[PDB]
Amino acid sequence: LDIQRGATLFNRACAACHDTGGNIIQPGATLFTKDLERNGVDTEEEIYRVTYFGKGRMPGFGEKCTPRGQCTFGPRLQDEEIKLLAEFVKFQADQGWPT
Ligand code: HEC
74 in a labelled binding site = no
Decide: 9 in ligand 1 pocket, CB within 6 A: no
- Distance between CA atoms of residues 52 and 60, nearest Å: 5
- Cα of 70 vs centre of ligand 1, distance in Å, is 12
Experimental approach was X-ray
- Is CATH 3.30.2040.10 the right assignment for the domain spanning 1-99? no
Radius of gyration of the chain, Cα coordinates, nearest whole angstrom: 12
30 in a labelled binding site = yes
78 in a labelled binding site = no
State the resolution, in angstroms: 1.2
Of 66, 67, 70, 59, nearest to 13 by C-alpha is: 59
Decide: 26 in ligand 1 pocket, CB within 6 A: yes
Domain ranges of the chain: 1-99
